Design a protein around this ligand. Structure first.
Ligand code: NA
Lengths: 287, 289
């Protein structure tokens, strides 16, 4: 019988952030083909905690040899991890982690440090601005991402720490809205804000909006190398993109499971991923 | 018998730039121990022609299967590369390219783009600055490094395209001294009290950074290259604002790997391997690997 590694990740469309993590998973599968391993990828609605509970219970009943997954908020993840620990099934957290429920290994960015870093870079662009804006993506009241929330916290800590006088504005766009009207009104109400940032992976939304309205007097800092994000980076609507090597996170998760289960090797638990800064001038050599 | 790859690098002290490239080479040797290969590292005097010739000749006379070589003063190398081609000994360039003498493969940054990028980052720092300064350190007059010279050209191009009004000052420190580095700096900052931002293209930015630290001067920030320990310390202390890395470990590792699969695995290999232009700050340096 083949090895089965259950991979539980957020629902998404092809080409979005999670596409790269999955390609890393598949690359790992082929690499370890001599061991006949198999990745069974299922998804959950990151905005609906019950979706995580139902799908994670399915994973549990599939009795995989190992599991890698993006945790949702703590209290809705606890039952899953407790069950896996009780069944002796090792799990790996990716993207974010739950510190009081340690896994075999964690692969993701130090969210707080990532946010702190982002603030430092943003202040470099808006050195003497009186306000900056944080764009978010919410649905059913939640932000749907521990990392997106924890990054903002680190960000805010840096701001309160180095630029307490700079006013921080927030605009919560709707996940499955029209982002355009939201933006039109935002700029009408706040016509002098020159710089903004988002902690989700869809800064292109704001970028394309500016590109279309011929607005070149506003630049964004965003996350991840989604095709559309990079286009906005090259066009100038986005000043910097922060990457976390999603492919490597996916690959290393499977490799770690293999190392632990197959090779029976010891493995490092905490694996903070880098906080890579990309600009139009260095993106082409970034791999 | 065995496979022998001669690696010719500039003499240096442990902890300088090349120490990482050497670790890379070592990691590669062990990884391919199966094919029983050995990397023979020899250091050379980069500014003593007669010396360089003697060591290079010694390398050629060792009859190596392959060679990886980091060029400093290209005008002292034609004899070496002609001899390698004549003997059918494939060679790899790292860090700097020597256009009139193409190698089997090259590993290093696209110097032009690296400098262009460096300019962008410096100007984010010196937005409204009338002048900026490039810091260099020459031996026998030469700026000994095509990568360095070329980086400077890309830097000036960006400055011409974006801040043609900004004055570009230059301060040359000398290795074949008796004019001490700190004395050069005192005169410069004395005659140029207003300059607030600077940059260097060699990997010894710590010389300027530690100077500012010991003089508790905090009204000036540098942009430098490479993750030498002294560079990182200056990065963490604030004298240096940004450091640009190029993954020296991987360049050394890849050099040997390329030689192995070319000579041993009879594989095809790309000639140009442009390394990344990584930007590091105090806030992300600890998570870079
Ligand atoms: Na969200």
């Amino acid at each position: 019988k083949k090895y089965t590694f259950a991979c539980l990740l957020p629902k998404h469309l092809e080409g979005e952030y999670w596409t790269d993590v999955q390609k890393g998973i598949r690359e790992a599968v082929t690499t370890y083909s001599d061991f006949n391993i198999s990745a069974n990828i299922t998804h959950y609605d990151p905005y609906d905690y019950n979706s995580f509970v139902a799908t994670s219970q399915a994973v549990i009943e599939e009795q995989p040899d190992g599991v890698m997954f993006a945790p949702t908020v703590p209290q809705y993840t606890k039952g899953f991890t407790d069950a896996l620990n009780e069944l002796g099934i090792p799990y790996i957290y990716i993207d974010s982690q739950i510190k009081d429920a340690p896994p075999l290994a964690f692969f993701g960015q130090n969210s707080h440090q990532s946010g702190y870093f982002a603030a430092r870079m943003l202040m470099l662009l808006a050195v003497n601005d009186r306000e900056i804006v944080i764009f978010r993506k919410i649905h059913e009241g939640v932000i749907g991402s521990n990392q997106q929330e924890s990054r903002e916290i680190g960000f805010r800590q840096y701001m309160q720490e180095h630029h307490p006088a700079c006013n921080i504005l927030e605009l919560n766009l709707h996940a499955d809205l029209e982002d355009s009207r939201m933006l039109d009104d935002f700029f009408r109400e706040h016509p002098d804000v020159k710089h903004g940032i988002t902690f989700n992976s869809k800064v292109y939304i704001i970028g394309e909006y500016l590109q279309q309205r011929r607005k070149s007097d506003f630049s964004l800092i965003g996350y991840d190398l989604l095709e559309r994000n990079v286009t906005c980076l090259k066009e100038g609507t986005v000043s910097f993109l922060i990457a976390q090597q999603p492919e490597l996170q996916g690959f290393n998760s499977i490799k770690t499971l293999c190392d632990h289960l197959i090779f029976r090797k010891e493995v490092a638990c905490t694996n903070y991923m880098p906080i890579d800064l990309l600009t139009k001038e260095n993106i082409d050599y970034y791999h």
